[PDB]
Design brief:
244 residues, alpha+beta, five-stranded antiparallel beta sheet, 35% helix, transferase, nucleotide-binding
Length: 244
């Protein structure tokens, strides 16, 4: 492999653009420190291999190799939703619907593999601009799905679910749905719903004028304070806004 220009830096490590020497394929090399992250390969590798077995969702980026330096696939041209929205603004409900079902099926697959992404947000959805195809990146904070709940959260406060704020505990699915909730809101609205803890635990949603009733309805379904109240992946797919 040949590394190239930087793409982004941060707590997720450092992702460089690069290429595979033999076939000149465009790849991304994510560099992770040993004691500043979290056989005996990193969890992230373990997870991506389970996810990448057979073939991805295929809205999940695939790990090509690991050395810590993880060589993953890199669509060209690419851009993440966060930056997408920042340049274009809210997506429209047509497009949003489009990406959103993509994203849910991506996740759906991971769950079948037994992986939970645990940090679904605009930054961690990669848009292949040529194929208009959203792809789930960064399993740095993800973990193995199980019955037992999780007592650790790497996400930002504003993205956290009310049961994390409330009890420092959350189950995979209902937390995932929340995140999708936030995600959907982000796309259609052009920014996240909640800032302060009062609002998250209250689920105080004030929609702008253009969000279709049918849309709003699903967001509110997903941003239910009670975890039980929240829909499941399958049901989100049936939801009236998601059709057509």
């Amino acid at each position: 492999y040949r590394l190239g220009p930087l793409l982004g830096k941060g707590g997720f490590g450092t992702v460089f653009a690069g290429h595979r020497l033999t076939d000149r394929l465009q790849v991304a090399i994510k560099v992770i420190p040993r004691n500043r992250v979290l056989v005996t390969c990193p969890l992230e590798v373990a997870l991506l291999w389970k996810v990448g077995a057979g073939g991805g969702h295929p809205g999940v980026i695939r790990l090509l190799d690991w050395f810590f330096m993880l060589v993953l696939e890199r669509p060209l041209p690419a851009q993440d939703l966060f930056d997408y929205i920042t340049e274009k603004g809210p997506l429209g409900e047509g497009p949003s619907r489009c990406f959103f079902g993509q994203v849910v099926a991506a996740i759906q697959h991971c769950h079948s593999r037994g992986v939970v992404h645990r940090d679904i947000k605009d930054e961690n959805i990669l848009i292949d601009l040529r194929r208009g195809c959203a792809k789930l990146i960064d399993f740095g904070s993800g973990a193995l799905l199980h019955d037992e709940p999780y007592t650790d959260f790497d996400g930002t406060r504003v993205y956290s679910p009310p049961e994390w704020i409330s009890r420092h505990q959350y189950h995979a699915l209902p937390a995932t749905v929340w995140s999708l909730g936030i995600l959907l809101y982000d796309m259609v609205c052009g920014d996240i719903p909640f800032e302060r803890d009062q609002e998250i635990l209250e689920a105080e949603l004030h929609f702008p004028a253009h969000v279709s009733p049918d849309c709003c309805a699903l967001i509110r379904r997903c941003l239910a304070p009670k975890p039980s109240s929240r829909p499941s992946l399958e049901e989100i797919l049936l939801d009236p806004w998601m059709q057509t």
